[PDB]
Design a protein around this ligand. Structure first.
Ligand SMILES: C[C@@H](n1cc(-c2cncc(N3CCCC3)n2)nn1)n1ccc(N2CCC[C@@H](NCC3CC3)C2)cc1=O
Ligand SMILES: [Ca+2]
Ligand SMILES: [Ca+2]
Ligand SMILES: [Ca+2]
Lengths: 254, 213
């Protein structure tokens, strides 16, 4: 019956009790994504100092993972003041998508302000629901405004412009709560984004060595190495490859 | 905290009821039929009708639980702020079957199947003596035919604020509960026991009719 009472009784989060956590489609499709993917490209850049307009061409998808103070609670952290001042509209394609990790506090409001500031409309709210199966007997220090124990983070999806390539994913990711000081987001967010087949120019801002991935440009201050060349990157999307969704056959040459 | 005052309700158009007669509540919950910009089988309130709801008269110090879907994730935030609340939490209800498997629904407007319903939590004033942090912000519960929302929310609210008077807007008959007054247009007449409220109701509505004012 009541998983809320059960959490109060035992410290086992209700999400611990979700089960199952047809599709020979997904083989053929994860396959086409893998074949259409650009080689991974990455650039160490202090994004507060760096002029974002140096990142060309204009992106189909932007994943934005600013390091919020709330991720570290056990200098280099970004406030919503800092984030809202990023010139995201200057690098987004006129038809494009954003995925913004907003945390579980004031970001759920300030991230929506950011999306609309950059010219997007919030179209999905993806919740990362965290289980505590391995350690139900731990007690987090509550944020002062919090009414409830916070057990999830939100990734807001934004769209700008107008609305073999369907839709099977759900607006939930369920994983175990990471060890203390592990600030990684579930790699499942990349799976959801790639499955939308939105185009091949994909930017991950505030990514890390650990998040570098085929089909993505990763930009962040902690990257140890760079391979980014604007001209090389642009050449991946040159004719005849300009309008590929990232879920179709690579176009044949000689 | 001991108090368990029996269920009370008022069948009304919530646009027209004078909620000043009901006094003050530790917790407000609303589950509005938001205008989500599509042909629906039920009546919706316009954005302006939602904005104009006299929520500010219901509380001095306490919490607001506001269910939101689709474009109402943004309109509900506007209403919450307009009514004098700060959003301080957001509950999600993961809808399951009897076997704790997620029920995943798809709109033709949408990029993703939806596994959850959102509830904004607002605070007004200086609430004292609430039990913050007993429950967590994820409900896992079965879809029922008699209610739009899971009964688990009433337990979370009771643990948060035991024995305090509470008010629900856009409630169904299954939703009537001890310590709650339920408002909605599918309820069966009027049922009032709080002498303070019965007086003020008689005095405001002596011919027991709640017409367009
Ligand atoms: C019970 C019913 N309902 C409607 C009213 C009501 C009261 N006063 C006025 C009114 N009007 C509707 C037309 C204009 C005036 N409607 N009172 N109770 N109701 C409540 C919610 C609702 N919705 C739409 C379906 C999903 C619900 N939210 C589900 C979320 C909580 C998990 C909200 C539809 C509905 O008919
Ligand atoms: Ca900084
Ligand atoms: Ca929006
Ligand atoms: Ca307290």
């Amino acid at each position: 019956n009541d998983y809320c009472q059960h959490f109060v009784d035992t410290g086992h989060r209700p999400q611990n009790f979700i089960r199952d956590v047809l599709r020979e489609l997904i083989r053929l499709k994860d396959e086409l994504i893998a074949k259409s993917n650009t080689p991974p490209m990455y650039l160490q850049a202090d994004i507060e100092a760096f002029d974002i307009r140096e990142l060309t061409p204009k992106f189909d998808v932007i994943l934005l993972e600013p390091p919020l103070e709330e991720y570290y609670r056990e200098e280099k952290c970004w406030t919503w003041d800092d984030i809202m001042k990023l010139e995201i509209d200057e690098i987004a394609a006129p038809r494009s998508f954003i995925f913004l990790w907003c945390g579980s506090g004031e970001g759920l409001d300030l991230g929506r302000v950011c999306l609309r500031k950059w010219g997007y409309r919030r179209c999905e709210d993806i919740c990362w629901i965290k289980t505590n199966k391995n350690n139900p007997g731990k007690t987090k220090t509550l944020d002062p405004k919090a009414v409830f124990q916070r057990t999830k983070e939100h990734c807001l999806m934004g769209i700008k412009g107008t609305v073999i390539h369907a839709n099977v994913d759900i607006d939930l990711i369920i994983t175990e709560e990471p060890e203390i000081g592990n600030i990684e987001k579930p790699v499942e967010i990349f799976h959801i984004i790639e499955h939308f087949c939105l185009g091949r120019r994909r930017l991950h801002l505030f990514g890390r060595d650990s998040t570098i991935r085929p089909g993505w440009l990763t930009v962040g201050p902690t990257l140890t190495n760079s391979n980014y060349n604007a001209e090389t990157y642009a050449s991946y999307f040159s004719a005849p490859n300009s309008y590929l969704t990232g879920c179709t056959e690579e176009i044949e040459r000689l | 905290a001991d108090r368990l005052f029996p269920p009370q309700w008022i069948c009304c158009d919530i646009r027209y009821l004078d909620v000043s007669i009901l006094g003050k509540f530790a917790v407000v919950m609303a589950d509005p039929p938001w205008d989500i910009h599509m042909e629906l089988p039920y009546g919706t309130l316009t954005d302006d009708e939602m904005r104009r709801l006299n929520i500010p008269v219901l509380q001095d110090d306490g919490f607001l639980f506001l269910w939101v879907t689709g474009r109402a994730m943004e309109l509900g935030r506007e209403c919450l702020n307009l009514w004098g609340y700060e959003r301080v939490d957001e509950i999600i209800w993961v809808k399951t079957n009897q076997l704790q498997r997620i029920i995943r629904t798809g709109r033709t407007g949408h990029w993703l199947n939806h596994g959850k319903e959102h509830c904004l939590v607002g605070v007004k004033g200086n609430p004292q003596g609430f039990n913050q942090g007993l429950d967590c912000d994820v409900i896992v519960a079965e879809v029922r035919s008699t209610s739009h929302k899971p009964d688990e929310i009433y337990g979370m609210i009771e643990r948060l604020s035991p024995g305090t008077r509470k008010i629900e807007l856009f409630g169904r008959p299954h939703n009537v509960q001890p310590n709650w007054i339920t408002l909605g247009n599918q309820l069966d007449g009027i049922h009032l026991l709080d002498p303070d409220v019965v007086a003020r109701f008689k005095q405001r509505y002596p011919d027991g009719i709640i017409s367009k004012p």
